[PDB]
Each structure stands twice: as C-alpha cells, then as structure tokens.
Amino acid sequence: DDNHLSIVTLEEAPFVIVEDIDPLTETCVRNTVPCRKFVKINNSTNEGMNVKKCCKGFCIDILKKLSRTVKFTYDLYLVTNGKHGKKVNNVWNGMIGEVVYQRAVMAVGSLTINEERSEVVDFSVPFVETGISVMVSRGTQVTGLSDKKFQRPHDYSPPFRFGTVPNGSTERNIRNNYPYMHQYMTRFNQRGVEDALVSLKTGKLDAFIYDAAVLNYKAGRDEGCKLVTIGSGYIFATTGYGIALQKGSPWKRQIDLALLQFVGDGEMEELETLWLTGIC
C-alpha cells in the first residue's frame, strides 16, 4: 500500500513503447508491463474507461530495475491531459501536471529536466543525456541553433524552413532564448516526430529541431541514412531525462542512488545497446 505507487508515463519510442494487449489471452507478454490508458466514450460526456495496454522500452526497463532495487510495486498509466508537460495559464499539464497535482507519485519516460519544471517537481539524477539538436538531410551546412539562418531567417532568399514539435521543453527553450526565431518557427510546427521526418525527406522542411536523444535514435534507424544530426552529435542546452517526483518525495534519494548504481555496474550501458543500437 505504502510501497504501491501511482506512476505516469507517455509513449515515445524507444523509451516508452505501447502495445495493444491482445484479447483471448488477457496477459502482457514476457518483457512488457501492464499500463492503462483512460479513453473517452464520446465528446459529449466525461464518461470513459481505462483500457488495459502493455508497455515496454528503455524507461520501462529502468522502472523495473528501480521497482526491484528500491522495493516498490506500481500501477502504471498513460497521461491523457497533454504530453510531457507545459505550463498553460500558470497550470501544469502532462506528466509534470499529474505529479504536481498528486495523481502520480512519479513520472517515467522521455521527460526532460529543465529549470521551470524543477520548481514544481523534484527530479532524479539525469539517466539519459539529451538536449536540443538539429536534424537535417546529409550535407546541409548549419552550425546549430546559433546559426544565422535560424536566428535571422529572413536574411536569406529563400528563407530556411525549420520547425519543432510545440509545447515541449525544446519549444520552451527557443521561446525564451530566440524570440524572433520562435515566432518565425510557429508556421512550421509539426504534430509529432513522425510527421517531421516525413516533411524532411520530401523537402517540405529544411531542418527539424528537437530532443537530441530522440533525434539520435531516429538518425540511426533512418533508411538511406541521409537524415543526420547537425553536430554531428553535439548538443545545445545539455541536460537529461529524469524521473519526476513530488516536491519533497521520500523516494528521491533512494531512486538517485539506485540510478547511479545502475550506471556504475554496467546495467545502464547494456540497456542502451538493447534499445538504442542503430544501423547508421
């Protein structure tokens, strides 16, 4: 009961991957764990039902190790109110919101540590290196976010077309550091990573700006290997994915020491090769 925790997550491969629980069988296969997802009956009601699904991935594997080592059980569910977390009219949604408003004891996934989030929740040590990278077609010459094609887009004819996925930690950072770039970008907003990668390969987009760890994963599995990160590898606003906890959580230092232990004894690097080995 005290060691049975409400935990929230969000789908973003290869860190969190959601699979339909198959019928007839009722169970979740060997390497996956149960996760539930609140699905609405209709749009003229508040009525809904929790659909049982199955979750796997890097962060889920991390969650299992923590569950063993720190000794707790959990009820994992998928966020439905927004995604990773955005402050809207001074109110947090997404995974950050679920923790802030105490519907979840912790949040696990591709959750980026930044300053404004650290004000309303406690973060574990970073367990996945990330930040802001730029994905382009191979050969494209851009220094990075600080390149003047991004900073002052209309100084070029035709203007460089680049965009991000809104409402995440990447957009928050650009809005604060590069006001002109940001208000220029908005017209090239993408609904998600998949859309953006399609826009790149068909020439409708020149660059895609996003989370480094996800972009690096997608570069290594691109067909033709002509979609690369601009570094290639270097990162702006270096930070990490972290486990989000309620402010002053009693689980914090145990989770921290556990994650650091995983790093030191080789378990972390093996999860990397298991989930994030590419071809390119």
Ligand X SMILES: O=C(NNC(=O)c1ccc(CNS(=O)(=O)c2ccc(F)c(Cl)c2)cc1)c1ccccc1
Are residues 109 and 9 in contact, defined by beta-carbon separation less than 8 angstroms? Answer: yes
Least CB distance from residue 278 to ligand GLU, whole Å? 19
93 near ligand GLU (CB under 6 A): no
Q: Nearest distance from residue 4's CB to ligand X, in Å?
A: 27
| Binds ligand X (CB under 6 A): choice among 115, 155, 194, 272 | 272
Q: What residues between 190 and 219 interact with ligand GLU by CB under 6 A?
A: 210-211
Neighbours of 84 (CB within 10 A): 25
Is there binding between residue 129 and ligand X (CB under 6 A)? yes
Q: How far apart are CA 96 and CA 88, in angstroms?
A: 12
What sign does the dihedral 216-193-133-118 (CA atoms) show? negative
Long-range contacts of 257-261 (CB under 8 A, 24+ apart): 258/65, 258/66, 258/69, 258/70, 259/62, 259/66, 259/124, 259/125, 259/127, 260/125, 261/69
List the structure tokens of 138: 């191979």
Q: Is 110 annotated as a binding residue?
A: yes
What is the C-alpha separation between 166 and 56, in angstroms, rounded? 25
With tokens 């203007």, the residue in question is 159
User: Quick check: 274 binds ligand X (CB under 6 A)?
Assistant: no
Task: List the one residue from 129, 155, 194, 270 that touches other proteins (CB under 8 A).
Answer: 129
| Nearer CB in complex with ligand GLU: 94/271 | 94
Q: Which does 61 bind (CB under 5 to 8 A by kind): other proteins, ligand X, ligand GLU, none?
A: none
- Please tell me whether 169 is known to bind a ligand: yes
Instruction: Decide if residue 168 touches ligand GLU (CB under 6 A).
Output: yes
Binding site for ligand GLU (CB under 6 A): 84, 110-112, 168-170, 210-211
Binding residues: 110, 112, 117, 169-170, 211
